[PDB]
Amino acid sequence: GAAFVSKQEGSEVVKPDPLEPRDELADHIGFQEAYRRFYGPV
Amino acid sequence: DSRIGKLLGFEWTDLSSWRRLVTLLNRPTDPASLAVFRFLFGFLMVLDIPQERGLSSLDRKYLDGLDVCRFPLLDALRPLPLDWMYLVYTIMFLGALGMMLGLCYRISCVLFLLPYWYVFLLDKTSWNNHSYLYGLLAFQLTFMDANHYWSVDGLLNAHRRNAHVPLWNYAVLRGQIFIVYFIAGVKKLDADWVEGYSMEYLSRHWLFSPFKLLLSEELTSLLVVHWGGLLLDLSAGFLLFFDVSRSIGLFFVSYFHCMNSQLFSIGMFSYVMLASSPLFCSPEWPRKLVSYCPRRLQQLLPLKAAPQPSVSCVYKRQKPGLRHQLGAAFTLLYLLEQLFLPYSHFLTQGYNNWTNGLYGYSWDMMVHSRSHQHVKITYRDGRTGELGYLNPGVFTQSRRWKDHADMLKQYATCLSRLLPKYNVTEPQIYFDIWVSINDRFQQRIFDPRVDIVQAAWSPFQRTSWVQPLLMDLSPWRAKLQEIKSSLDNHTEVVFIADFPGLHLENFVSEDLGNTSIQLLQGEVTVELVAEQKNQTLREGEKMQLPAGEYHKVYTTSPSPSCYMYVYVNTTELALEQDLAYLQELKEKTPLVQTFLRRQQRLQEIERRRNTPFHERFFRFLLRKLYVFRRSFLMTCISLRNLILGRPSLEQLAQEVTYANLRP
Ligand SMILES: *[C@@H]1O[C@H](CO)[C@@H](O[C@@H]2O[C@H](CO)[C@@H](O)[C@H](O)[C@H]2NC(C)=O)[C@H](O)[C@H]1NC(C)=O
Ligand SMILES: CC(C)CCC[C@@H](C)[C@H]1CC[C@H]2[C@@H]3CC=C4C[C@@H](O)CC[C@]4(C)[C@H]3CC[C@]12C
Ligand SMILES: *[C@@H]1O[C@H](CO)[C@@H](O)[C@H](O)[C@H]1NC(C)=O
Ligand SMILES: *[C@@H]1O[C@H](CO)[C@@H](O)[C@H](O)[C@H]1NC(C)=O
Predict the structure, then answer these.
(1) Contact A19/B368, CB-based, under 8 Å?
(2) What residues does Ca(2+) 1 bind to (chain A)?
(3) B506: chain A residues, CB-CB within 8 Å
(4) What secondary structure letter does DSSP report for B198?
(5) Domain map of chain B by residue range?
């Protein structure tokens, strides 16, 4: 599924984060169906 | 009457006994400067709840039926259903509204304090130094008499109207803001700060422009950013306290927080610390500005009269009761543990990594900045042995777990129970995370051979599977920037330090033609997996690597070895050998829209310059209007779901698209 990666993309090494400042949050694994499960067809 | 009495506000005879210290700390003080901070903190918490607490993004975060690895501090803290987390956030909103107005202030403080610290401890990755502070300022203010001036509690209850507060309501609040400032100034005595490494990019902002007139930009980042933020944080609570240097100190800490309101997006931190710095002034200062206005205006303002006596203070002629001894105890005990918890890192050593302790409670803002090169998460099936590879960020809603060993043990445990929904029976999960802190060599932070599901973590034992930060390779950082400046616009470099016995298995993608590895220090042995051929390198020897194939860099030195990956992306180079060939023939078919999608983005990022400030600001208030409207309308959906029940999905769908409307 989308929870896994192959052994060509998980082994690519190449492809500043201060911990103080405060977005994605909807690019989850089973998000769009668990959203429509609890809500309507949005 | 002494020299020290005019200077510190008390003499040593006020510290002669416990009774004279209770009398000093419960000395009757004007409620006015405490109750303008109560408004300005409770109004900046009303704004903070839809924006930074995540009320407007609560449906995306705490959604029911979602496979998610959560990081609470105490692992017994489970979040409620989404319908009830909208009730926690509307109780916290009524708490911040009754703390703002002063309406039922003791009830409305624990209506804000209790669901804030529930939400705060429910996610270790949302911890900042300000979201910790807002739960500290709301914790103190539960016990302070902040509804004793400018409140509707004054209008309803007549004995709370304009009445004296004890001195300890200011000595805790001034003692907190002194601890916020001064402990941040000795967290910035680290060698990464006094040498100009943390926030090295910050002087390139346009707000450091007048300092460029006298200094270089190499020295603007060293003096103004690093030594100017050291000598302000070290001496802000000394300048704000004393009367001779407060107006010099109030100007320097107003500028320091109007800069940080734009240099960083840290929520309301720059406005809470701006509303707190007048607590160091004389407590009569709201009455000294009420009297300066026209005469019939002050009936909408609070009262300018002298404060009436209160039961909460100790007066001169009175034996101090049990409440007055609980204010001289709360002042000394809490300002002791506020001085101790930024240095309590020898106790909670299980939370200790490359930086000391968990983030949020140590006042080391901007002292350590990280950059991750590579995360490789490798599961291993329990009944087969299929060595498979997970996505680097599968069920997490954050990227802070890769720095902290307590959160990696939480992620490896949560992945051990979530992966059987994807036919992995009992995984053995290995994390291979490459972090470089403050422009250092990239190295593994955790050992890549340890099974983190069965690895031993406890909060008070130093973790066995955390690699030490190689600080003897910290002299190399002047040479690494010399190599980075030696490269052209095309070639990139990845500096990597590896431990003895460990190796790095890198797959150079086929886009990276002409990549090579040059050993800077140590002794590695580069294996090419497709040819099964080794080649031992020593210090200074380069070696070209194939594109599209595997290679392994085995460290064979007894000391940690250091090397670099001087690669160039010849795919996007040959793309810009054709697109920069295409544009000159334009002013005379997969590639033509890739040119046009870059001429597309050239249109709107340039009108970022060409938009006015007044319509920028008008759009920013529209955004804010939509984040306050969605958070109000999605609350009423889930507040109807508990009272009236949950309707059909087609009628739930009509409201959420209505709530998600741009206004
Ligand atoms: C190239 O050299 C490396 C470095 O010694 C070899 O890696 C070793 O491989 C054996 C067998 O797989 C392991 O038992 C050792 O632990 C490895 N060394 C280290 C440091 O981990 C590799 O096998 C060599 N390859 C070839 C083709 O000769
Ligand atoms: C479980 C639900 C009801 C929430 C309950 C809130 C509890 C857990 C909260 C409310 C007030 C909080 C305290 C507020 C202030 C501090 C000082 C801080 O430096 C360490 C944590 C500490 C000591 C907190 C511990 C947790 C605390 C007691
Ligand atoms: C690869 O890039 C380096 C970077 O300077 C350059 O010196 C070298 O000539 C390049 N080699 C090829 C084959 O393009
Ligand atoms: C090289 O550039 C292309 C863009 O043409 C990009 O898609 C690719 O990811 C880059 N290579 C790497 C290793 O990032």
Answers:
(1) yes
(2) 20
(3) 11-14
(4) T
(5) 23-181+282-340, 370-469, 476-574, 576-604, 613-659
- Adjacent-strand bridge partners of B506: B551
Asked if B380 and B427 count as a contact pair (C-beta separation under 8 A), the reply is yes
Q: Taking the mean position of all CA atoms in its chain, how far away is CA B271?
A: 16
Nearest Cα residue to B432 out of B350, B496, B528:
B496
Kindly state the tokens that stand for B436. 């470089």
Burial B62-80 (b: 16+ CB within 10 A, else e): bbbebbbbbbbbeeeeebe
The count of other CB atoms within 10 Å of the CB of residue B287 is: 23
Q: Which strands, in side-by-side order, build the sheet including B491-498?
A: B491-498, B561-568, B515-521, B542-545
Q: Which of residues 539-578 of B touch A (CB under 8 A)?
A: 550, 565, 567
Is the distance from CB of B378 to CB of B345 less than 8 angstroms? no
Rounded Cα–Cα distance for residues B178 and B172 (Å): 10
Is B319 designated active site? Answer: no
Alpha-carbon span B205 to B209, nearest angstrom:
8
DSSP summary character for residue B554: E
CATH for the stretch B476-574: 2.60.120.10
Locate the chain A residue with the closest alpha carbon to B363. Answer: A20
Q: B127-165 burial by CB neighbour count: b if 16+ within 10 A, else e?
A: bbbbbbbbbbbbbbbbbbbbbbbbbebbeeeeebbbbbb
Q: Give chain B's radius of gyration (CA, Å).
A: 30
3-class DSSP string for B462-503: CCCCECCCCHHHHHHHHHHHHHHHCCCCCEEEEEEEECCCCE
Residues flagged as binding site of A for Ca(2+): 20, 23
Report DSSP letters for A1-42, one per residue: -TTEE-TTTTT-S---EESS-----S--SSHHHHHHHHS---
Mapped onto helix, strand or coil, the DSSP state of residue B547 is coil
Q: Let me know: does B71 contact B316? Beta carbons within 8 Å.
A: no
How were these coordinates obtained? cryo-EM
- CA torsion B153→B157→B158→B164, rounded to 10°? -50
Q: What is the rounded distance in angstroms from the CA atom of residue B278 to the CA atom of residue B622? A: 32
Quick check: B323 and B432 in contact, CB under 8 A?
no
Please list, residue by residue across B11-28, b when 16 or more beta carbons sit within 10 angstroms of its beta carbon and e when fewer do: beebeeeeeebbbbbbbb
Rg (CA), chain A: 16
CA B4 – CA B7 distance, rounded (Å): 5
Q: How far is CA B362 from CA B29, B233, B340, B436, B486, in A?
A: 31, 14, 10, 21, 38
Burial of B483 (0-12, 13-18, 19+ CB in 10 A): middle
Q: CA B384 → CA A10, B256, B387, B413, B422, distances in Å? A: 21, 59, 9, 20, 14
Locate A3 and state its tokens: 């929870």
B341 lines ligand 2 (CB under 6 A): yes
Q: Which residue of B has its CA nearest to A24?
A: B397
Q: Output the six-digit token pair for B14.
A: 């006020």
Nearest to B567 among A14, A19, A22 (CB): A14
Q: How far apart are CA B284 and CA B31, in angstroms?
A: 8
